[PDB]
Amino acid sequence: ADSDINIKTGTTDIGSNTTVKTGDLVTYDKENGMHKKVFYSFIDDKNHNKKLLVIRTKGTIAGQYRVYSEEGANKSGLAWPSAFKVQLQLPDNEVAQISDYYPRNSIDTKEYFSTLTYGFNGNVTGDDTGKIGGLIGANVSIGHTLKYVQPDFKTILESPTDKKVGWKVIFNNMVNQNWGPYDRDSWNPVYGNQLFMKTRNGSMKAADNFLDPNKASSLLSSGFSPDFATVITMDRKASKQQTNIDVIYERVRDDYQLHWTSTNWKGTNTKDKWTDRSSERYKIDWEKEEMTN
Amino acid sequence: ADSDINIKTGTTDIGSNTTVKTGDLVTYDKENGMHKKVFYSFIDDKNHNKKLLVIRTKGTIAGQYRVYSEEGANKSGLAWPSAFKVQLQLPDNEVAQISDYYPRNSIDTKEYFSTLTYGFNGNVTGDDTGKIGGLIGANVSIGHTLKYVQPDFKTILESPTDKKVGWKVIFNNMVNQNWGPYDRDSWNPVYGNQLFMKTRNGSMKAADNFLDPNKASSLLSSGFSPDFATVITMDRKASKQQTNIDVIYERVRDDYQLHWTSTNWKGTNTKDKWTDRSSERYKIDWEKEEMTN
Amino acid sequence: ADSDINIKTGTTDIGSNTTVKTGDLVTYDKENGMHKKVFYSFIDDKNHNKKLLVIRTKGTIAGQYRVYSEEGANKSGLAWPSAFKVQLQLPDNEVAQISDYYPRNSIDTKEYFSTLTYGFNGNVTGDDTGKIGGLIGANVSIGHTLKYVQPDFKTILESPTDKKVGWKVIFNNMVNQNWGPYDRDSWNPVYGNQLFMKTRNGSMKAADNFLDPNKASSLLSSGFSPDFATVITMDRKASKQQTNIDVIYERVRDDYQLHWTSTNWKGTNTKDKWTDRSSERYKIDWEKEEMTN
Amino acid sequence: ADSDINIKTGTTDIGSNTTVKTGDLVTYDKENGMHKKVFYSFIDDKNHNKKLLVIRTKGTIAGQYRVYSEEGANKSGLAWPSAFKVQLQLPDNEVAQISDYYPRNSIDTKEYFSTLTYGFNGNVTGDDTGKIGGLIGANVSIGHTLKYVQPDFKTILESPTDKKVGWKVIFNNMVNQNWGPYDRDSWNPVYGNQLFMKTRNGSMKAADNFLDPNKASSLLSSGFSPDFATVITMDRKASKQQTNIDVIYERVRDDYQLHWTSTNWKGTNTKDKWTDRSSERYKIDWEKEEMTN
Amino acid sequence: ADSDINIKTGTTDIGSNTTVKTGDLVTYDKENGMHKKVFYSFIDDKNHNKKLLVIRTKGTIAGQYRVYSEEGANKSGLAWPSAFKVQLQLPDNEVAQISDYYPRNSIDTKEYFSTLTYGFNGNVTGDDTGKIGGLIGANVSIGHTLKYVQPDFKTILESPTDKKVGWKVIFNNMVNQNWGPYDRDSWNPVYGNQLFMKTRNGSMKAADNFLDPNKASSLLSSGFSPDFATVITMDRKASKQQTNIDVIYERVRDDYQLHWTSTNWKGTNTKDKWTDRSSERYKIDWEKEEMTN
Amino acid sequence: ADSDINIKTGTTDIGSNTTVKTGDLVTYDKENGMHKKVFYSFIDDKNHNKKLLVIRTKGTIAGQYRVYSEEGANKSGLAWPSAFKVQLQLPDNEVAQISDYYPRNSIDTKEYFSTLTYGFNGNVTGDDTGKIGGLIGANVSIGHTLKYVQPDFKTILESPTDKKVGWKVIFNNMVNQNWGPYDRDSWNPVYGNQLFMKTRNGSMKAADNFLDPNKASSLLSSGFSPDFATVITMDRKASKQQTNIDVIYERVRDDYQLHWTSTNWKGTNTKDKWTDRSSERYKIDWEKEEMTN
């Protein structure tokens, strides 16, 4: 923090005495079920060595957790979102560069407990016949407890370059009706992967034995809303003051299949089965200070 | 804090009534997979005995966690980042000096529990005949519990001088599928180092038995984003008002090998096998208040 | 706090409508490995009965955790920082005085749990022979738990005077690979002081059986960064408007020796074996409002 | 808070549109080891029915935890601060009055646990010899847990009047190498008061079996820094616009003795053995709005 | 909150563009040991439908925990504060009214834990004489835990009217040397009420077997500092612009007695034995905007 | 929050550049024991489509917990507040409307722990006669605990309309001397409802076996202070600029009865035995911007 280095808070921040131009650009991809919104801000601070553009990618990518396949009452398939992504890419010719972005990857932590306990105890017996009993015992034990927080989905900043940046919101694990947590690799000898299995050996049809979307992570169905910021800089002396940039919203889906084993339900998950990719190109005019698509 | 010594908050900070000049310089080193960004700020506060330059080293070093070695079905190696580093250095013929930096090393703490428990307990018996049972016991107990937090990586400020300063974000330890945690020295007689081992005796190719990056620290794969601040002071009277400074982003990688031993998997970790070093020289002009590369 | 006594917050603080003069002074002691930085601020608030100078002592003293001795693979010694110190001192004839300082010693606390638990229980036994029976017991138990946080190092304000003030950041205790915590007095008959012992029976050179510095408190190696403040007051009527003041950064190292008895590893620690002291005189000029060295 | 009663925050606070006069006064009592500082502030708010003086007593009273005597290697004494005090008092005649002060006595709390547990259990047995045993038992348990925080020292506001006010920072209890806590009355039949006892059977000299100050509350040794505030009000029409006020800084020391019985060490603590009192008279001039000593 | 109803914060508060008149009035009652202070504020905001007076009652009522009776060496009584009260009252003829007050009563809460546990287990044994047996057991548990915070004293707003309001800070319960808590009704057939009993068998005289006040809630001895606010509104058209008001500081003391039975100590507490009442008449002048006594 | 939708904080709030008129209206209902205070604010913001009036209902409704009948030493009746209510209502012909209100009903949460535990243990026996016994056993456990906070009273927003709004603060449950919690339906075959039962076997007059109010929720006796806000909107073009509004403050009492069976005390509670309703009519004049009663 600036105060950590004895400098008035905000002194090195950009944007004072500058007229900022902002804009909203909304696009809805019906086919891919994606509400894509770009919120931008041009900050041409004359005391900063370069022009600046802040591109915030928001909107919402529908989860689309649903039963798509049905072949009899013994088998059924559920397509679900295992990953959500947003990426911005400047073509190689562009002199403009990706300079910063938020959020980024943070360091996770964990709690660790080490426990040592000593135990000494006595004892004395006695019966209605005159016999006197007794006992002496010792005991020791070491224990360890590991504790940590596990989000249903992880928000990750993908290694960026000066031309492209991206984020992927990936399914981590999830609690199934107090059971689990389960993940894309969970495997039980009897039931396989119970990730979205409603009952282990219920009587109903397969297509009706998938977890209630309302009982699973809301991102799986209703969707995920990106809230990412990308900072792009541009030399003021650059000969060409226009820049193209592609923005891609994507959804990776897994395949969760159920099938009656004759005595119980067994689950199977196939990773990255389908990939819904919606791309769009925008035009950045550093002179008019507007962005169009 | 200022209020702690009866002085109006901020009274002592540098920067007020000063026109600050800022700049951004981006550099992508593809072979080393490093998005290196310098955010600078020149503060020439006339009420401060020296000129200040605040250099912020950001951007992000890719993790690059990958199975690069595959020597048959029983052998495979994984390269991973055991350390990320950023260092700034002023040559010896410079009158400019390193004055402050952030973050710095913090004093870690731990929680401790001391427990003493003791009690007594009666007892009486009797069978369908006439015998009477009776017991009397005592028991003492002593237990101690140590509880502390462990981040996946530790952020450390390396001993600085007035010419050089640096930080290293080193791998600490990590939880492997609700187990461990493990570190670079974890050693088990049967499985060796299980740090990134996915299964202990599963039957798949070696190169397919490494832990999914999505299940390990995101820094290992997607990467770490430095956010370090360095402040450099310069005398307004020094003969030469130009300073060179070299900035180095570095990634030290370890080698995690896995090999099948007739009946199970075993792992070994080789420390600091590789070191990806990306260096760049910057020119600092205190009169123009510009920084360039 | 001001609010607690019905006064507008900040009403009694010093520094308003005053032009504050500040400065940075950096000195690097190569022999002692100390980056010493003074950040001062002159506050001559005319509505205050005296001139005021705030001296912030910062920079960082390197830890210097290193194996220095090694007499055969069975003997080796390690030097570590048990204490870091920073002191300011006005020569006795100075009319200027030390008036305040920060941080100060805070009152430590602890959590105490006292538990009383009792209960009754019954029982009924039988056998295919047709026998009947029953057991009746009762129990009581009293237990208590003590909980408190222990920093690896304690930051202490030494008893000051109107001519000298100082701080010592002393090693308290530390966790050794999930065990401990250990301290300078930890003693085990079999292994002695295991503070920095890597393994108990390990079969390696003694110079290789010391704990990895990354697995220990970062202040031990990379170092500690002081951030203390000292306020000095001065009478405006004082005849000599110049004041000398010496600042001393200090490091105290202990000696942790490891030797192989014949069956296992044993450790010993020698207190305050070495003392690195780096002193420096500064001149305070209350008329020019500048500090020089 | 003002907002709780629908009034603009800070509307009723004193001090606005007022020129406040502050001052600092430092005195060092060499014999008593007391750095005494008084930071004052005159607030003559014309919209207030009275002139105000806020006196903040700060500085530091050294702990002085010291081994003072030793007659035989089996007997020794340690002096320690069981209490620190700061008191202000206006002479009888004075028309000025003690109006407010901070801190004050807060209401302590405790956490309480009530737990009831019901249970039943069965147990069917037998043996290779055809036998078949049975078992049916029940149990009930009632237990409570008290949980509270306990500072090493308590800060108490002594019953004030309109002429005097004072604070005492008294020793409460302390953890001794993870045992206890102990206090001035602790008593073990064998060891006596183990308050500052380093070892129970140690064979060193008595003056070498006292707890190291680094492992005990820093107030005991390095000292305590008062930070108390007193508000004095004065009528503008009082015919005598000058006021004297006396201030006492005090340390009360206990006597902790260790003597070797013949088999082990035994501790004894005698209360209030010594008292170090430092008194000063300050002169308050409400017309010149300055305080002197 | 104002934001909860989409209104700019502070929009409805009173006090803007208004000159507020404040005052301090101090009274010390020697006989009753009560420092009494009124801090008033007249807010005649012309955009408010009435004149307002905020009266804050502070100061401090001494605890006065004292051994007042000593009938021989086996009987002694201790007077302690079971309640502190502060009340304000407008004579019923006054047209001025009590409008608000703070603090008020808050709704307490408690935490509730419900636990169900079930488990199975096997057990196979064998002896040198070839005998081989087995065992199977099943069990269930149902636990309930109640957790809640217990302040040593409760701060309560007494049912107000438009002419009188008061607060009472009443003794709730207290811990005695890690035991209890105990309260005015605690009773043990052996030792009676152990609230302030130092020892159960101590061979000292009665007067010397009372709990050390330093080891009891500091409000019992040093005292309680009231910090209550009362808002009084007044019609601007009222013919009589002056109002009288009485303020009462009060202390209710209980009588805790200890007597030696012959084998142990037994204590008993008598409620509301004594009542110290300190009343004072103040004059409120709404035109001159001043309070006097 | 505005920031969530990229809008300058406070941008959409109402109140700026508007002269707000406020007022206080106090009424004390003697017979009903209710201090009723209304604090209103007219906000006619010309950039808002309607005039606004914020009405805040405050003051306090006495609890009035009291023994109302003693028909014998074996029978007594206790009256206590099971619910507090405040309701506002616009007569059906009013064009003005109820637009907002605070507080509202919030979603309650609970914590759930699900735990699984399994383990093994051996046991080797042996006696002097030469016998050598052994034992091996397994064990599994499934336990889960529910954890949630329970306030003594619930604050509920009754289903509002454009003409009426109201709140009811209702008794939920309460801890009775560390046991329970008990509620209006608690029942024990032996004791009935122990909600306010002081002792189970005690031999005193019935009217003397009710819980001490100081040991129960303060709302039961001293009372509850409403702090509700309701905003009314009005069209500036509405033909009649005068509005009537009726306000109800109310207390619902339950009848708690204790009778002596002959061997112990048994408690009974009858719901909504009494209702104390206090109603007032206020006149709102939107042109004069004043409220009166």
How far apart CA D270 and CA D185 sit, in angstroms, is 9
Check C123 against D146: CB less than 8 A apart. Answer: no
Torsional sign, CA A206, A208, A213, A214: negative
Q: Read out DSSP for A53-78?
A: EEEEEEEEE----EEEEESSSSEEEE
CB pairs < 8 Å spanning B and D: 8
Q: Do chains B and F touch (3 or more CB pairs under 8 A)?
A: no
Nearest to D225 among C52, C97, C104 (CB): C104
Subunits next to A (3 or more Cβ pairs <8 Å) are B, C, F
Check D105 against E224: CB less than 8 A apart. Answer: yes
- Residue pair B156/B170 in contact (Cβ under 8 Å)? The answer is yes
How far apart CA B118 and CA B139 sit, in angstroms, is 5
How far apart CA C80 and CA C267 sit, in angstroms, is 14
Helix (H, G, I), strand (E, B) or coil at D85: strand
- Residue pair A5/B231 in contact (Cβ under 8 Å)? The answer is yes
Q: Minimal CA–CA distance to C152: which of C178, C168, C170?
A: C170
Nearest to D112 among F39, F56, F178 (CB): F178
Check D119 against E136: CB less than 8 A apart. Answer: no
Resolution (A): 2.2
Check F112 against A39: CB less than 8 A apart. Answer: no
Sole residue written with tokens 């028909």? F71
Nearest to E127 among F133, F155, F231 (CB): F133
C14 to chain E, minimum CA–CA distance in Å? 25
How far apart CA F213 and CA B30 sit, in angstroms, is 75
Burial of A142 (0-12, 13-18, 19+ CB in 10 A): exposed
- Cβ of F131: how many Cβ atoms within 10 Å? 12
How far apart CA E213 and CA A55 sit, in angstroms, is 65
- Residue pair B137/A124 in contact (Cβ under 8 Å)? The answer is yes
Per CB-CB distance under 8 Å, the chain F contacts of D112 are 178
Backbone angles phi, psi at D270, to 5 degrees: -115, 125
Per CB-CB distance under 8 Å, the chain D contacts of C44 are none
Per CB-CB distance under 8 Å, the chain D contacts of F178 are 112, 114, 144
| D183-190 LR contacts (CB < 8 Å, sep 24+) | D183/E215, D184/D82, D184/D254, D184/D269, D184/D271, D185/E212, D190/D264, D190/D266
Check C6 against E178: CB less than 8 A apart. Answer: no
- Residue pair E146/E160 in contact (Cβ under 8 Å)? The answer is no
How far apart CA B38 and CA B292 sit, in angstroms, is 10
Helices (H), chain D: 218-221
**CA-atom Rg of chain D in angstroms:** 29
- Residue pair D69/D77 in contact (Cβ under 8 Å)? The answer is yes
Residue D25, Ramachandran bin (φ over 0: left; ψ between -120 and 50: alpha; else beta): beta
Per CB-CB distance under 8 Å, the chain A contacts of B140 are 119-121
Per CB-CB distance under 8 Å, the chain D contacts of E180 are 146
Check B219 against A105: CB less than 8 A apart. Answer: yes
Backbone angles phi, psi at F129, to 5 degrees: -70, -5
- Give me D36's structure tokens: 């005494």
- Residue pair C230/D26 in contact (Cβ under 8 Å)? The answer is no
- E strands in chain F: 21-29, 34-43, 51-61, 66-69, 75-89, 97-102, 111-122, 133-151, 153-158, 164-171, 174-176, 179-182, 228-234, 242-260, 265-285, 290-292
- Give me A4's structure tokens: 């950590």
Nearest to B119 among C37, C142, C178 (CB): C142
Q: Read out DSSP for C123-184?
A: EEEEETT---B--BEEEEEEEEEEEEEEESEEEEEE---SSEEEEEEEE--EEETTEEEE-T
- Residue pair D27/D36 in contact (Cβ under 8 Å)? The answer is yes
- Cβ of A185: how many Cβ atoms within 10 Å? 15
- Interface probe for C, chosen from D48, D132, D179, D222 (most Cβ of C below 10 Å), is D222
Per CB-CB distance under 8 Å, the chain E contacts of D9 are 10, 13
How far apart CA C10 and CA B6 sit, in angstroms, is 9
Q: Which residues pair with B102 in a beta bridge?
A: B229
- Residue pair C205/C77 in contact (Cβ under 8 Å)? The answer is no
Calculate the alpha carbon distances from D171 to D181, D214, D218 in Å: 12, 17, 12
Check B144 against D179: CB less than 8 A apart. Answer: no
Per CB-CB distance under 8 Å, the chain A contacts of F6 are 39, 56
- Residue pair A43/A202 in contact (Cβ under 8 Å)? The answer is no
Which residues neighbour A31 within 8 Å (Cβ) at sequence distance 6 or greater? A278
How far apart CA E257 and CA E259 sit, in angstroms, is 7
The H-or-E segment that residue B135 falls in is: strand B133-151
D149 to chain F, minimum CA–CA distance in Å? 20
Residue of D nearest to B143 (CA): D178
Q: Minimal CA–CA distance to E274: which of E64, E93, E73?
A: E64
Maximum Cα–Cα distance across chain E:
110
Q: Minimal CA–CA distance to A34: which of A56, A58, A60?
A: A60
How far apart CA C104 and CA D226 sit, in angstroms, is 10
C227 to chain D, minimum CA–CA distance in Å? 18
Sole residue written with tokens 């911005």? A88
How far apart CA E266 and CA E278 sit, in angstroms, is 34
Which residues neighbour E280 within 8 Å (Cβ) at sequence distance 6 or greater? E27, E36, E246, E247, E248, E293
Per CB-CB distance under 8 Å, the chain A contacts of F144 are 178
Residue C210 DSSP label: B
D71 to chain E, minimum CA–CA distance in Å? 32
Subunits next to E (3 or more Cβ pairs <8 Å) are C, D, F
Integer distance in angstroms from the first to the last C-alpha of chain F? 38
How far apart CA B161 and CA C31 sit, in angstroms, is 12
F124 to chain A, minimum CA–CA distance in Å? 14
- Residue pair A78/A208 in contact (Cβ under 8 Å)? The answer is no
How far apart CA F274 and CA F254 sit, in angstroms, is 7
Subunits next to F (3 or more Cβ pairs <8 Å) are A, D, E
**CA-atom Rg of chain F in angstroms:** 29
How far apart CA B96 and CA B237 sit, in angstroms, is 11
How far apart CA A81 and CA A275 sit, in angstroms, is 9
C151 to chain B, minimum CA–CA distance in Å? 4
Nearest to C112 among E39, E56, E178 (CB): E178
Which residues neighbour E213 within 8 Å (Cβ) at sequence distance 6 or greater? E63, E65, E220, E221
Per CB-CB distance under 8 Å, the chain B contacts of A160 are 35, 60
Check A56 against F112: CB less than 8 A apart. Answer: no
How far apart CA C35 and CA A270 sit, in angstroms, is 57
| C191-196 LR contacts (CB < 8 Å, sep 24+) | C191/C264, C191/C265, C191/C266, C191/C267, C192/C266, C192/C267, C192/C268, C193/C256, C193/C267, C193/C268, C193/C269, C194/C267, C195/C256, C195/C267, C195/C269, C196/C78, C196/C80, C196/C256, C196/C267
Calculate the alpha carbon distances from D100 to D24, D51, D228, E292 in Å: 20, 13, 11, 18
How far apart CA C238 and CA C235 sit, in angstroms, is 5
Check C178 against A6: CB less than 8 A apart. Answer: no
Which residues neighbour F263 within 8 Å (Cβ) at sequence distance 6 or greater? none
- Residue pair A209/A215 in contact (Cβ under 8 Å)? The answer is no
Check B6 against D39: CB less than 8 A apart. Answer: yes
Which residues neighbour A70 within 8 Å (Cβ) at sequence distance 6 or greater? A76, A77, A205, A206, A207
Which residues neighbour D145 within 8 Å (Cβ) at sequence distance 6 or greater? C113, C114, C115, D112, D113, D115
Residue of A nearest to C38 (CA): A6
Which residues neighbour E159 within 8 Å (Cβ) at sequence distance 6 or greater? F33, F35, F60, F62, F63, F64, F221, F222, F223
**CA-atom Rg of chain A in angstroms:** 29
∠ CA C231-C234-C240, rounded to 5°: 135
**CA-atom Rg of chain C in angstroms:** 29
CB pairs < 8 Å spanning C and E: 6
Burial of A126 (0-12, 13-18, 19+ CB in 10 A): middle
Check D178 against B6: CB less than 8 A apart. Answer: no
**B231-249 b/e (C-beta count within 10 Å ≥ 16 → b):** bbbbeeeeeebebebebbb
D173 to chain E, minimum CA–CA distance in Å? 10
Sole residue written with tokens 């007050």? E101
Which residues neighbour F176 within 8 Å (Cβ) at sequence distance 6 or greater? F182, F194, F195, F196, F197, F211, F216
Nearest to D114 among F22, F56, F179 (CB): F179
Nearest to D144 among F39, F175, F178 (CB): F178
Q: Do chains F and E touch (3 or more CB pairs under 8 A)?
A: yes
How far apart CA F198 and CA E150 sit, in angstroms, is 19
Residue B221 DSSP label: H
Backbone angles phi, psi at E250, to 5 degrees: -145, 150
Nearest to E218 among D9, D156, D160 (CB): D156
Residue F261 DSSP label: -
The CATH class of F1-293 is mainly beta
The strand order across the sheet containing B21-29 reads: B21-29, B34-43, B51-61, B228-234, B97-102
Q: Do chains D and E touch (3 or more CB pairs under 8 A)?
A: yes
How far apart CA D13 and CA D6 sit, in angstroms, is 15
CB pairs < 8 Å spanning A and C: 6
Residue of D nearest to B146 (CA): D178
Per CB-CB distance under 8 Å, the chain A contacts of B35 are 98, 159-162
Residue of C nearest to D100 (CA): C5
How far apart CA A13 and CA A45 sit, in angstroms, is 11
- Give me F270's structure tokens: 């009858």
Backbone angles phi, psi at B221, to 5 degrees: -105, -80
How far apart CA C2 and CA E96 sit, in angstroms, is 31
Q: Which residues pair with A181 in a beta bridge?
A: none
Nearest to B162 among C35, C58, C152 (CB): C35
Residue D221 DSSP label: H
Q: Which residues pair with A22 in a beta bridge?
A: A41
Q: Minimal CA–CA distance to E104: which of F59, F214, F80, F221?
A: F59
Calculate the alpha carbon distances from A253 to A66, A158, A184 in Å: 11, 19, 11
